[PDB]
């Protein structure tokens, strides 16, 4: 219930080329996350990294190439850990691997906060259905298990019968899209989900974007806010160490602004930071700078500012 702050590592992925994403929490932990947050006068509670062990064959090969049942089922264990953390009065930060963890953290939140809304910052809409993308895409496919209007087009995969769609199409706003499949594009249109693509930001501005965003979410009533920030939303020059880097994305300035704005509502309840994959960096510098950016996002969302803060009454 966002009075203090919980840090939860959830190193989940499906393996294959994007398996260094499971190493993201350490990378961010190693960007000095907790210092910052501690030094932002936050009471912190570090809930550690979750067990991610494949079902039902934990032999080598499955670890390198994981099955969907294994993720869906690790999200169940996540929703539970998110749920209890909210229940004890904490704001959830979940350091991620692949954007699929959003399934467990939104499901967890919804549970003790059923009026919540979502800001999905991302180059992708991650809103494919199981029948619209490959076995591999579950990271780019998690929003069709949460939205409540898609269940007519969404089948029962084993590991996923616990998920109970906890969002209507009018509770999620997208910021930063530039890489959207036709299946996704039609869904956005057809079910009247509002979104601000890189085009709408060129036109409107990050200032007017956030203005329009809040009106559509918290405009006629206060709700708890769930920021699912995906790192590939930042232009790749800023965030190179990620699996699907798409060019033309947020500047550093745009991204902090978004965080700055979310904090300034003082309604933020849970935050997801995902797709940080150090195996994909050109150097240690590139891995480090990506995680440094990811520590800034969180810091901002939890009160960091570019112009000062805190307390002083200075001496002579």
């Amino acid at each position, epitope marked *: 219930m966002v009075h203090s702050v919980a840090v939860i590592g959830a190193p989940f992925s499906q*393996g*294959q*080329k994007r*398996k*260094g994403v499971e*190493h993201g929490p350490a990378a961010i932990r190693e960007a000095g996350l907790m210092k910052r947050l501690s030094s932002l006068g936050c009471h912190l509670k570090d809930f550690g990294d979750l067990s991610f062990t494949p079902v039902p064959k934990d*032999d*080598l*090969y499955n*670890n*390198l*190439i994981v099955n969907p049942r294994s993720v869906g089922l690790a999200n169940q264990e996540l929703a539970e850990v998110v749920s209890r953390a909210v229940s004890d009065g904490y704001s959830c930060v979940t350091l991620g691997g692949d954007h699929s963890l959003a399934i467990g953290t939104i499901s967890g939140h919804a549970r003790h906060c059923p009026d919540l809304c979502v800001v999905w910052v991302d180059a992708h809409a991650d809103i494919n259905t199981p029948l619209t993308t490959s076995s591999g895409n579950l990271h780019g496919q998690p929003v069709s298990f949460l939205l409540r209007e898609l269940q007519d087009k969404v089948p029962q995969l084993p590991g996923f019968s616990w998920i109970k769609p906890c969002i209507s199409s009018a509770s999620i706003v997208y910021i930063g899209l530039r890489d959207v499949d036709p299946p996704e594009h039609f869904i956005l249109k057809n079910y009247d989900i509002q979104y601000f693509s890189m085009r709408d930001i060129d036109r409107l501005g990050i200032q007017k974007v956030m203005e329009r965003t809040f009106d559509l979410l918290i405009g006629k009533r206060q709700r708890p806010i769930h920021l699912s920030f995906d790192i590939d939303a930042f232009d790749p020059t800023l965030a190179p160490a990620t699996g699907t880097p798409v060019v033309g994305g947020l500047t550093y300035r745009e991204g902090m602004y978004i965080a700055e704005e979310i904090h300034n509502t003082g309604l933020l309840s849970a935050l997801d930071l995902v797709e940080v994959n*150090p*195996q994909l*960096a050109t*150097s*240690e510098e590139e*891995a480090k700078t990506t995680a440094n950016l990811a520590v800034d996002v969180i810091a901002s969302s939890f009160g960091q500012t570019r112009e000062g803060g805190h307390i002083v009454y200075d001496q002579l």
Partner: antibody
Amino acid sequence: QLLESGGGLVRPGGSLRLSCAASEFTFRYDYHVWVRQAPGKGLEWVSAISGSGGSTYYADSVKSRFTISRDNSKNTLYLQMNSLRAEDTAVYYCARLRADLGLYMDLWGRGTLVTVSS
Amino acid sequence: VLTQPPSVSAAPGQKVAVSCSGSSSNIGSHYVSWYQQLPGTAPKLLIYDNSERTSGIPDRFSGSKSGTSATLGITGLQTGDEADYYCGTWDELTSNLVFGGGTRLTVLG
């Protein structure tokens, strides 16, 4: 590059300890294995370890005698060999293990000789 | 556990196919890599996911899988090609990576 060492002549019943020094900073994020080649026979995968050393896997051929370890701080993989026999006599090779549609070993070392003769 | 025939022959400029036979639990079910053992050197990766070349390897090399078997085509045979070629994949009955015994290709120039 991968570069193995600390092979040598050891007497049956003997122990020995290999190192593999990797160059990549991405070494710590990636499974590595150990494959040995008995002199002019084929390749036999011996052991494999996870990026963090939470998970080790061993071949029936070498299980419980051999122990795979790594120190990411030193960008080094190790193999501790105990209870060594003639039939362990082989060139031992570190390798990086990665996934895509299936599994392939994309980075390898020069090798190191273990002779186990009475 | 994988069977590939032991030897192969040709003069520079010609072509061969090294065959790899396995089963249900591996090739029938998993992807196959191809590794070139230059004599007196550690092997090098040529092909993963049945036919995916790695950088700088020319298109002379081609891999192919069908049910329970796989095959490495090599055309326009050259000196410095002659070496030991091994197939590799994962067997889901024993839970390991397996290789073929190897094939020695000598180029008679």
